[PDB]
Every structure is written in C-alpha cells, then in structure tokens.
Amino acid sequence: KVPPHSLEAEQSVIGGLLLDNERWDTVSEHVMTQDFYSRPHRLIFDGVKSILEAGKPLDLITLSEYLEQREQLEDVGGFAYLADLAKNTPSAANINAYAEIVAERALVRNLIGVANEIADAGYDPQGRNAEDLLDLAESKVFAIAEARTSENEGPKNVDSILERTLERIELLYKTPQDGVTGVNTGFTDLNKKTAGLQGSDLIIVAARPSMGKTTFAMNLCENAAMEQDKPVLIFSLEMPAEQIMMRMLASLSRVDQTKIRTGQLDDEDWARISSTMGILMEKKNMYIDDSSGLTPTEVRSRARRIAREHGGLSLIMVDYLQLMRVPALTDNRTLEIAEISRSLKALAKELNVPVVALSQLNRSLEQRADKRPVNSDLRESGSIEQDADLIMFIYRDEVYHPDSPLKGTAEIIIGKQRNGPIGSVRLTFQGHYSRFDNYA
Amino acid sequence: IKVPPHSLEAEQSVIGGLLLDNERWDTVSEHVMTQDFYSRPHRLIFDGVKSILEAGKPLDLITLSEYLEQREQLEDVGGFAYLADLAKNTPSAANINAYAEIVAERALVRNLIGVANEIADAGYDPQGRNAEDLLDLAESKVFAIAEARTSENEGPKNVDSILERTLERIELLYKTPQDGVTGVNTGFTDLNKKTAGLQGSDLIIVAARPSMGKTTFAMNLCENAAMEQDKPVLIFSLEMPAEQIMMRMLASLSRVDQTKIRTGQLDDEDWARISSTMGILMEKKNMYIDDSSGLTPTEVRSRARRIAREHGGLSLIMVDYLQLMRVPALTDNRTLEIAEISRSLKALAKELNVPVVALSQLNRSLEQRADKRPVNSDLRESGSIEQDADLIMFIYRDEVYHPDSPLKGTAEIIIGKQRNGPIGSVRLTFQGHYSRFDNY
Amino acid sequence: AMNLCENAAMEQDKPVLIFSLEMPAEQIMMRMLASLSRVDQTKIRTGQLDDEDWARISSTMGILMEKKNMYIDDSSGLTPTEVRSRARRIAREHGGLSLIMVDYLQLMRVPALTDNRTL
Amino acid sequence: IKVPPHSLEAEQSVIGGLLLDNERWDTVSEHVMTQDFYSRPHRLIFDGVKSILEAGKPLDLITLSEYLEQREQLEDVGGFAYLADLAKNTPSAANINAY
C-alpha cells in the first residue's frame, strides 16, 4: 500500500515556478501547500508561495535566502537541490497540468486517510453508537469537499455580489463608446449592443425555421472575411460548400438567389458576379468543411490545424449544433448537446476567436401564439445558457402574421449577453437575394 | 486484530426468543433484517423464522427444522441439535427488542467498514477515476447507509400525542393577527392562506413551462425571505450568473423597468430608488448566491451545510434548475439521475430544517393538449419528484397562450400537491415589465 | 372513511386504528375536528376562527380525550408485513382493536412484487 | 516463414514523435487509429496519447506515464523506461505523417 503521490510532478511545479514567475497566477488555483507530499517539497512550496504572493522576484537565491533565515535550507537539501530542480525540469507552460496531477494525488490520498479513520473507528468505537459513527463518517468526507471547492467558487457574500453587479452595470455605459472591439459584425445597429464579436466567448444564434438562421450566420462571416485580416472557418453540415458559396455570391452582388441556383441569368447580372469574384479571390479567407459526420474531436482538430497554418483564425461558424454528434454519448441525447456546447466554448477560449454556433428552437413556441423567442425555449434542446455568453434570436413579424407592420424587417433580439447589454435590434431583411441590411 | 463487528450471542437470543414467544415478531421485524444477521447459519435460521411467522403463524423446533430439511439447508446450519439448543441456551423473553437493536447496530457498523474499504481500494486502484469523481463516489457510499437509517421507530401514535401537537399548532395561529405564517413568509397574502408559511422539513418544487416566469417567482420568494426572516437565504445559480440575478432583484426592489438596468443608461430618479434599496440590502446581509454551473448533489449539500454553520443557520435554499444539476455516478441513466437529485434535495431540507425551493421545467406534452394548465402528472415524465417533494405548485398565466384572455397580467399559482396544507388555484397579478409578482 | 372511524371510536369501547398514507395525522385530525364540531373545514386549516367556533372545538376535545381510541400511523412507506405487525401490536397492547382503516390501497407496496403491478 | 505485415519501428516513431511535438496530432489523427497499431503494448500507449491530446493539450514523458500508472498498464507496456526510450530512439520530427 504505497500512498498516491508523484514526486516527479512536484519537482516540475517548483522548478517551473523558478523559471517562470508569471505562471503563479494559474498554479495557485490548482495546488496548495497541504497538497504536496513529504516535508521537503512542502517547505519549498511554502517558501515559493510566501515569496510570490508579495515580493514579485523569485529565483535560486531568493528562495535560498528565505529558507536560510528560517533554518530550513539544509532540511530541504541545501542550495544544490534547489538549483538542481531547474536543471531537472526546464519545461515551462505545462505547469498547470503538473499541478493538476499533484492535486489529484492529494485529494485521493486524503480520501484514503479519511476512509481509514472511519474503518479504524468502526473496529474500535470506544462507546460510539451506530448513528454517531455514521455522522462522524459523513463529517470526515464533507471536510474534503470543503477544501477542494473553496479555492475557485462557492456562495459569495452580499458585498461581493454588490461589487460585481455595479462593475457590470458601469461597463454597459462604455459599450457604444469604445466601438468595435475586434470582429466587425457589419451591421451598425448591432455594433451598439454587441460592440464587436469577442473571442473568449461562445455566441449561439438560434431561430425557428423560415426566419433565416443560415442567412444571418452567412452575413456575419461575409463581413468578417473582408474586414478582418485573419481567415474565417465554416463547418457545413446542413448544406454543402457549393450551396453556401451560391448563397454568399447572391449577397456579394445583390443578384436574386433564384438566378444563381438555376443558372439562367442576364449579362448585367454576370458582370456583378465577375466583379465580386476577383475581390473574393484576392482576400482568401473562406475555409469551408462540407463534412456531414462531424464529432467535437474532429471540430477542435480541424480548427487548430487551420489556425496553425495561417497564423490564426478570426471567426468559427457551425451550421448546426444538433447535426454534430459524439460517439460516447449516442444513447443520452440530453448530455450529448451539453458536451457539444462545452466543447465549442472550450474552442473559443483556446483559439480566442468568436464562435458562432447555429441552433434551432423547439416547437413549443408555436402553440404559445406570441412566437417571440425567449432564452428559456432553447433550454429544452440542451444546456447552452451556462456555456454560451451571447445568445441572440431572429424574429421576423411577417413570417407568422401577414398584416404585420414589420414588412421585411427581422429583429435580432438579444436574450443573453455577459459582456454587453441586451435588447431588440431591428434590421431589414431581403429574402429575394439573402442579404440582411441596416434598418433606417 | 481486525475482527468484524458482530455479536453471535445476541443473534442466538433473537432466534431463541422467537421460538419461545411467537407474538414478539410484531416488534422484532421492525428492528432486524435477514441481511443484518452475521454468518451463513444464522441467516438461514432467521430467513426460515421470517418466512414461517409471517403467513404460517406456528413456529417451533419441528417447524423450523422441517423448513430447512426440505430445502437442504438443515445440515449446513448444524442439524436439528443446533436449532433445539437455541431454545435451551436463551430462555430470556421480552428483551428480544433490545437484542435485535444490537444486531442491527453491528450490521450498520460492519457495512460502514465495508463502505470505507471500498473507498480505500478505489483510491489505490482508480482505473481512470478523477479526484473529483472519487470524492463523489465516496460520499454516495456513505449517503446510502444514512438512507436506511432516520426511521426513528415510526408507528401508530395515540390521540394524546396527536391532540397535543394539533392544539399547539392551532394556538400558534392566533399570534398572527391575519398572517397565518408558521415560519417563512412568502410575501403574498393570498398564497399564505393555502401555504400557511414555508415549512422547513419538506421540499417545495415550483414548476413552470417557458415564458411563465419560474425564475421571477423563485426570486420573489427569496426577496421576502431575506427581508422578513433574520436568517440568511442561499441561492444556487445555474441558469444565469449572480450578476443577472442581482439585476433582476434590483428591478423588483425599486419597481424600475427591467430593461433600464440590463441596458445601462437610466434616469437620475430611477437611480435614487436603486441607491435607497441598496442600503436596505446592505443592512440585512442575507443574499448568498453561488454562480457555479457544474453543481453535483454532493457539492450542493456541502455548500448548504457550510453557510448554515458560519451564520448560525439558513432560512431558505433555492435552486435555479433541477435538470442543470448532475451526479457523476448516474450520468448514463437520466431517469435515475433526476430521482437521486430529488432525494438529495429533500434530505437537505430535512437535515437543515429549511424550506427548499427547487425550480423545475415541465415537459412539452402539455403544448399539444390544448388545455395548457399544467397538471402534477406532467412533471412525472421529467423524473420521480411526487414521492419526494411535499409542496408542488405550478405557474399559469392565461395571457401567454391566449391573447384575448380575461386574466390580462394575472398568473395563477395552482397548487397541485400539498401534504401539510390544502391545494387550490391562487390568483396573483404579474408585472413582466419589471419582474414583480403582486397580490391580486 | 373518516366518518366511519368517527362513530366507531365513540360507540365501540375498543380502539380504532388508521393507517395514513395519503395525508399526515395532523391533516386527518383537522378534518375530524371539523366533523366533530360542524365548523367549516376552511377555518381549521387556515387558523382564523370565531370565539363561538373555539368553544365547540374545545368541547369536543374533552370528549375525545376521555375515550382515547384514535390511533393514527402517518407512515408513507407501508408494506403488508408492517401493516399486519402494527395491527397485531396495538390489538395486543390495548386488549383488542375494533376497526382498521387504510387511507390508500395503491399507496401500500410489497418489495417482492415491485415489478408486477397486477399481482 | 509467414511474418505479419507490420512495422514496429514505424509505430515507435509515431508515439515518440507525438511526445516531442504535440502540435502534430492535427495531421496524425487523420492517418492512424488505435486499432491500426500492432500488438497490445503499442495500442495502450497510442490510446493514452489519443485520450490525452483530444482534451488536455499537454502531453510528455510524465503526462503519458501518469495516465498508464492510474489504469495499471504502465508495467504491462514496459515501465517508465520504455516510454522514455521512445523519445531517445526516434528524435525525427515533421516526418510523423509519413510514419
């Protein structure tokens, strides 16, 4: 019975912190002084923790002088062991993964000790009742949960919630003051509430059939490929790359959609098609993947490959959230959508590019007779509210009502947005040639 | 020497006592089980006694021996000589209830040791189990032993204890001039007639179909509990972060339209009402919100017990979504996952003695029904909650499905199930412009 | 069912046994107090009631305390083994029973036949 | 003698190359599968590399070692020494797609 520990992983956390002091911001969230195994490794990590928390510089002699003044330098292995730790593990950036190993061994090691306490108290109760021993065993397990979850999240105090609410309200004033903070949407009305497409968050655009969810997603990619220098990546699942390019050519030249997919078109229309063809060939940013069977593993691999080849991406768009599938969760449909939503959010955090994932609403709003898409309607499809930050819906009043005042105007109603404010942004729509425009 | 906790002498007196006095089985059956007995021979004799006494009332040396002779288990026990010796060895009647409690207590301690050994063996050999996964697995094994406990010898009570409890509840109802609140005040005088205060020992599940305002009604219950009750309230946020929850709560506290807070720019008059209610919330200090998306029933019970230990005790625990919570042990079966969460939330309400308002969403089966009124049987499709939760109330506004409805701006809280008090449709007005439920 | 137990507890000398599964013993006693004093059900479960109604509830309280026959078991999880054992236990402690009432036949459950609902 | 069509030397360079360059997985995953590898030891190492690179970006001598150690497959492969020997034996990056 050897205790669960990884002495090799502890050496790389300590050794990595001496080489890169800026890693402490992430390392402190994973490992604790108690989480380290053995007395020598705990004394070194306690010195590193005490130094990096107040005095920014930490090196071979900074850590040595902290231990020398506390009569613990010889106890850890002298100056030679502290200097040989840098020689032993010179692998930076992977310190977060090494800390996770040490933290996992510690939580498993604590569980073994806690279970052994219960086992020894069962054999030798010393006047303890079965009910008393049961509550004692629960309290020992509850203690490990208290130390593990108190580092990152828990029940925040009123003062902290008031501080985080007022800072969020003040940030809403400066949303149309800064302007585009990255990816330009193309719609000046949308740029007031969105204030540029942020890279660190997931954007989910949902619409009930006939609203034009694919059309709005294509229009966002249209402006991103021309304004932003970095290329755009589109995962086609609903329709092939040929149909996507035919729809994009209609918006680029304002020529009616029907003429492109039919073939028969005027010489004037062909001149407008040929004029936009040259500008599209000079930019070279449209990368489309017409694969029907796409798994979240293949999506993340293809996005990381294209970003590595051309420096970096700018916007990743998915044609359908429900068309993607994970082979491990083929039985449970509820947890399949939640895993895809998590995988798409992780891709947006890793690549730092805005991810526009398209999704479809449930048929529950059809029997409601109001038909305005609320953020709670998409919850039926899967868990996306906790993962995606920006959730905008497409609602055109002419689809459900023929005598509607919004004739040819679809309002992009933002139902959820952490970075900026929410609201109904009216934009005109031309269904004859698939092109969303600014409402006057 | 690690000898398993057992009392072979106590098992012989339960078996021996049942042979001498067959009328003791009425009390003995409530304490001991066939599984509770230690070793194969004692379990075979007790199983025979259990099968015989139940239907074939006469039980003796010849009845017990012939039951085992026909099943080829008599020789395994020790022939007839062993069964006849148990009547001779223990001729002490009436104390059988005390001997059974010893056997039941030894079995619980023996199971606790086996449960601790399971955790210890799983720690040494995880086979791909994470530290978080192993922690939740260790808690679930301990929780199972506590589930078989909490019986407290429930039986037929006399009229003296029922009338004493009934008179004390009736006499307490005269203290309130017209409130009728036996604890947590809901804030709605119409709701206080049927609910009669939020009881702590039971689980309250509020369910509503999207667009009804389930989050709005849950926030309004926490609003009055944080101001009226001295003990703090705990809210587990899964659907929306603590910032959005505080923005919605500020709209109800000052009657300022919801749109102005989440957008930014608002009038100086509106800011004065927000600043006036800020000082009221700062003096009370009861709103504790946990904006964690990944919440397991182990982490929920640990975070509720932590706050109920720091500030003396809690007053009301609210969950944003029942379906957003997940148990790693039941990720494959969705049916038994919801039933375990419903059981864990009910156990939290019994242990902490505070009303737990768990929010849940109805199935889309009521949309095709055309009746639109959600019945208690519609939530059964989501999971087993009827047997665990005592108070189940639904939110139904007639203006959501019908535009020409007479209930314009009035949502009726229809109570479908309530063990403590009576059920019925309680009409209450609703203001969707600033998220605030009021008295009709 | 409550009205049948009402007359059996007053007329017969032997006590009555009621197995509550649908509603607790508190709700059963509140409903029984409404029939014993003819005061509207709503006033008892709400709390607010007149001084005239207070005297009728207090008068019937002493009548029920002199007889001592209502034995209620507010257990939700009741198996046929536990029902027979508790019925035999009360009939042994108090000489003998007089009427056994069950709140719900479908709420009772046998662990051996949990799969087959028909049997 | 009917010797099966295999290349143990080519399997060692794919595994060894993935430990030196984690960014190669984008192209390597398109060519090889866990089933494609010959013998039980090479399949256990490649399955660990596949499971790690698909979610947790860092993969090295101790990341792969800890995955196999927790599942009781480290000694069945050849201890830690065999995993460290693959980095030493084949230090040829970029040609992993051909292997």
PDB file of C-alpha atoms in Angstrom, chain A residues 172-296:
ATOM      1  CA  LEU A 172     -22.705  48.791 -20.006  1.00  0.00           C
ATOM      2  CA  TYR A 173     -22.284  52.605 -20.279  1.00  0.00           C
ATOM      3  CA  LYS A 174     -18.995  52.222 -22.204  1.00  0.00           C
ATOM      4  CA  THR A 175     -20.297  49.588 -24.689  1.00  0.00           C
ATOM      5  CA  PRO A 176     -21.151  52.044 -27.585  1.00  0.00           C
ATOM      6  CA  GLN A 177     -18.330  54.447 -26.503  1.00  0.00           C
ATOM      7  CA  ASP A 178     -15.381  52.209 -27.453  1.00  0.00           C
ATOM      8  CA  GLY A 179     -16.865  50.880 -30.696  1.00  0.00           C
ATOM      9  CA  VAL A 180     -15.778  47.653 -32.400  1.00  0.00           C
ATOM     10  CA  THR A 181     -13.555  45.692 -30.011  1.00  0.00           C
ATOM     11  CA  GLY A 182     -12.417  43.109 -32.559  1.00  0.00           C
ATOM     12  CA  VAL A 183     -14.622  41.333 -35.104  1.00  0.00           C
ATOM     13  CA  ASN A 184     -16.897  43.701 -37.062  1.00  0.00           C
ATOM     14  CA  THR A 185     -20.453  42.354 -37.490  1.00  0.00           C
ATOM     15  CA  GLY A 186     -21.195  44.664 -40.447  1.00  0.00           C
ATOM     16  CA  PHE A 187     -24.471  45.979 -39.008  1.00  0.00           C
ATOM     17  CA  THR A 188     -24.046  49.412 -37.354  1.00  0.00           C
ATOM     18  CA  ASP A 189     -27.237  48.871 -35.292  1.00  0.00           C
ATOM     19  CA  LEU A 190     -25.919  45.513 -33.960  1.00  0.00           C
ATOM     20  CA  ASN A 191     -22.500  47.068 -33.123  1.00  0.00           C
ATOM     21  CA  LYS A 192     -24.132  49.247 -30.420  1.00  0.00           C
ATOM     22  CA  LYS A 193     -25.260  46.284 -28.269  1.00  0.00           C
ATOM     23  CA  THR A 194     -22.685  43.658 -29.355  1.00  0.00           C
ATOM     24  CA  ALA A 195     -19.720  46.116 -29.554  1.00  0.00           C
ATOM     25  CA  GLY A 196     -17.676  43.716 -31.681  1.00  0.00           C
ATOM     26  CA  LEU A 197     -17.570  39.913 -31.548  1.00  0.00           C
ATOM     27  CA  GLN A 198     -15.441  38.879 -28.527  1.00  0.00           C
ATOM     28  CA  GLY A 199     -13.088  35.917 -28.972  1.00  0.00           C
ATOM     29  CA  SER A 200     -13.079  34.454 -25.452  1.00  0.00           C
ATOM     30  CA  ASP A 201     -16.851  33.703 -25.502  1.00  0.00           C
ATOM     31  CA  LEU A 202     -19.319  31.423 -27.356  1.00  0.00           C
ATOM     32  CA  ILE A 203     -22.069  33.060 -29.441  1.00  0.00           C
ATOM     33  CA  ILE A 204     -25.195  30.979 -30.166  1.00  0.00           C
ATOM     34  CA  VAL A 205     -27.622  32.256 -32.822  1.00  0.00           C
ATOM     35  CA  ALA A 206     -30.994  30.476 -32.732  1.00  0.00           C
ATOM     36  CA  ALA A 207     -34.054  30.821 -34.956  1.00  0.00           C
ATOM     37  CA  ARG A 208     -37.263  28.903 -35.659  1.00  0.00           C
ATOM     38  CA  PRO A 209     -37.464  27.588 -39.300  1.00  0.00           C
ATOM     39  CA  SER A 210     -38.100  30.138 -42.137  1.00  0.00           C
ATOM     40  CA  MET A 211     -36.505  33.029 -40.173  1.00  0.00           C
ATOM     41  CA  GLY A 212     -33.152  32.744 -41.973  1.00  0.00           C
ATOM     42  CA  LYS A 213     -30.703  31.442 -39.368  1.00  0.00           C
ATOM     43  CA  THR A 214     -28.275  30.206 -42.053  1.00  0.00           C
ATOM     44  CA  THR A 215     -28.661  33.544 -43.930  1.00  0.00           C
ATOM     45  CA  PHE A 216     -27.790  35.599 -40.812  1.00  0.00           C
ATOM     46  CA  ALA A 217     -24.816  33.336 -39.985  1.00  0.00           C
ATOM     47  CA  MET A 218     -23.505  33.684 -43.566  1.00  0.00           C
ATOM     48  CA  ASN A 219     -23.848  37.503 -43.382  1.00  0.00           C
ATOM     49  CA  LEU A 220     -21.697  37.567 -40.204  1.00  0.00           C
ATOM     50  CA  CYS A 221     -18.959  35.534 -41.990  1.00  0.00           C
ATOM     51  CA  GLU A 222     -19.291  37.828 -45.071  1.00  0.00           C
ATOM     52  CA  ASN A 223     -18.145  40.955 -43.179  1.00  0.00           C
ATOM     53  CA  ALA A 224     -15.551  39.089 -41.070  1.00  0.00           C
ATOM     54  CA  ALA A 225     -13.767  37.745 -44.187  1.00  0.00           C
ATOM     55  CA  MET A 226     -13.479  41.240 -45.738  1.00  0.00           C
ATOM     56  CA  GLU A 227     -12.810  43.436 -42.675  1.00  0.00           C
ATOM     57  CA  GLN A 228     -10.625  41.115 -40.548  1.00  0.00           C
ATOM     58  CA  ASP A 229      -7.225  40.050 -41.956  1.00  0.00           C
ATOM     59  CA  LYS A 230      -7.343  36.592 -40.315  1.00  0.00           C
ATOM     60  CA  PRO A 231      -9.370  33.884 -42.141  1.00  0.00           C
ATOM     61  CA  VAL A 232     -12.846  32.558 -41.237  1.00  0.00           C
ATOM     62  CA  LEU A 233     -13.718  28.867 -40.774  1.00  0.00           C
ATOM     63  CA  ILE A 234     -17.187  27.467 -41.586  1.00  0.00           C
ATOM     64  CA  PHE A 235     -18.277  23.905 -40.695  1.00  0.00           C
ATOM     65  CA  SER A 236     -21.026  22.944 -43.158  1.00  0.00           C
ATOM     66  CA  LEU A 237     -23.397  20.165 -42.033  1.00  0.00           C
ATOM     67  CA  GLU A 238     -26.854  21.303 -43.250  1.00  0.00           C
ATOM     68  CA  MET A 239     -25.832  22.186 -46.836  1.00  0.00           C
ATOM     69  CA  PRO A 240     -22.656  21.588 -48.924  1.00  0.00           C
ATOM     70  CA  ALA A 241     -19.930  24.197 -49.651  1.00  0.00           C
ATOM     71  CA  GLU A 242     -21.347  24.715 -53.174  1.00  0.00           C
ATOM     72  CA  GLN A 243     -24.767  25.830 -51.834  1.00  0.00           C
ATOM     73  CA  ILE A 244     -23.034  28.010 -49.187  1.00  0.00           C
ATOM     74  CA  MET A 245     -20.941  29.728 -51.905  1.00  0.00           C
ATOM     75  CA  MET A 246     -24.039  30.191 -54.129  1.00  0.00           C
ATOM     76  CA  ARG A 247     -25.848  31.929 -51.223  1.00  0.00           C
ATOM     77  CA  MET A 248     -22.747  34.060 -50.451  1.00  0.00           C
ATOM     78  CA  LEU A 249     -22.477  35.141 -54.128  1.00  0.00           C
ATOM     79  CA  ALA A 250     -26.106  36.413 -54.023  1.00  0.00           C
ATOM     80  CA  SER A 251     -25.314  38.705 -51.057  1.00  0.00           C
ATOM     81  CA  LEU A 252     -21.982  39.865 -52.592  1.00  0.00           C
ATOM     82  CA  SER A 253     -23.647  41.091 -55.820  1.00  0.00           C
ATOM     83  CA  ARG A 254     -27.308  41.720 -54.724  1.00  0.00           C
ATOM     84  CA  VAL A 255     -28.484  39.386 -57.540  1.00  0.00           C
ATOM     85  CA  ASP A 256     -31.646  37.347 -56.736  1.00  0.00           C
ATOM     86  CA  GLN A 257     -30.890  33.918 -55.174  1.00  0.00           C
ATOM     87  CA  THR A 258     -33.047  32.065 -57.735  1.00  0.00           C
ATOM     88  CA  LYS A 259     -30.841  33.022 -60.736  1.00  0.00           C
ATOM     89  CA  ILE A 260     -27.628  31.592 -59.219  1.00  0.00           C
ATOM     90  CA  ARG A 261     -29.031  28.172 -58.208  1.00  0.00           C
ATOM     91  CA  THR A 262     -30.941  27.894 -61.551  1.00  0.00           C
ATOM     92  CA  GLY A 263     -28.179  29.037 -63.911  1.00  0.00           C
ATOM     93  CA  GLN A 264     -30.138  31.320 -66.242  1.00  0.00           C
ATOM     94  CA  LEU A 265     -29.034  34.917 -65.597  1.00  0.00           C
ATOM     95  CA  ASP A 266     -28.584  38.193 -67.541  1.00  0.00           C
ATOM     96  CA  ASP A 267     -25.261  39.616 -68.860  1.00  0.00           C
ATOM     97  CA  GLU A 268     -25.619  42.549 -66.390  1.00  0.00           C
ATOM     98  CA  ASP A 269     -26.003  40.030 -63.510  1.00  0.00           C
ATOM     99  CA  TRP A 270     -22.909  38.081 -64.699  1.00  0.00           C
ATOM    100  CA  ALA A 271     -20.825  41.303 -64.657  1.00  0.00           C
ATOM    101  CA  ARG A 272     -21.748  41.832 -60.954  1.00  0.00           C
ATOM    102  CA  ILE A 273     -20.877  38.151 -60.213  1.00  0.00           C
ATOM    103  CA  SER A 274     -17.499  38.525 -62.013  1.00  0.00           C
ATOM    104  CA  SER A 275     -16.703  41.808 -60.184  1.00  0.00           C
ATOM    105  CA  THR A 276     -17.123  40.220 -56.735  1.00  0.00           C
ATOM    106  CA  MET A 277     -15.284  37.014 -57.846  1.00  0.00           C
ATOM    107  CA  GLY A 278     -11.958  38.868 -58.132  1.00  0.00           C
ATOM    108  CA  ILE A 279     -12.251  40.575 -54.728  1.00  0.00           C
ATOM    109  CA  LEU A 280     -13.111  37.177 -53.136  1.00  0.00           C
ATOM    110  CA  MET A 281     -10.009  35.563 -54.724  1.00  0.00           C
ATOM    111  CA  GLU A 282      -7.677  38.356 -53.505  1.00  0.00           C
ATOM    112  CA  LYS A 283      -8.634  38.098 -49.813  1.00  0.00           C
ATOM    113  CA  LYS A 284      -8.593  34.258 -49.433  1.00  0.00           C
ATOM    114  CA  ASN A 285     -10.290  33.820 -46.011  1.00  0.00           C
ATOM    115  CA  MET A 286     -13.292  31.491 -46.651  1.00  0.00           C
ATOM    116  CA  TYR A 287     -12.428  27.951 -45.481  1.00  0.00           C
ATOM    117  CA  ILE A 288     -15.459  25.627 -45.659  1.00  0.00           C
ATOM    118  CA  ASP A 289     -15.653  21.991 -44.465  1.00  0.00           C
ATOM    119  CA  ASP A 290     -18.572  20.152 -46.139  1.00  0.00           C
ATOM    120  CA  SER A 291     -18.447  17.086 -43.846  1.00  0.00           C
ATOM    121  CA  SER A 292     -21.805  15.683 -42.650  1.00  0.00           C
ATOM    122  CA  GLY A 293     -20.394  13.456 -39.895  1.00  0.00           C
ATOM    123  CA  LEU A 294     -18.627  15.839 -37.515  1.00  0.00           C
ATOM    124  CA  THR A 295     -17.604  14.925 -33.956  1.00  0.00           C
ATOM    125  CA  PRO A 296     -16.461  17.549 -31.356  1.00  0.00           C
TER     126      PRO A 296
END
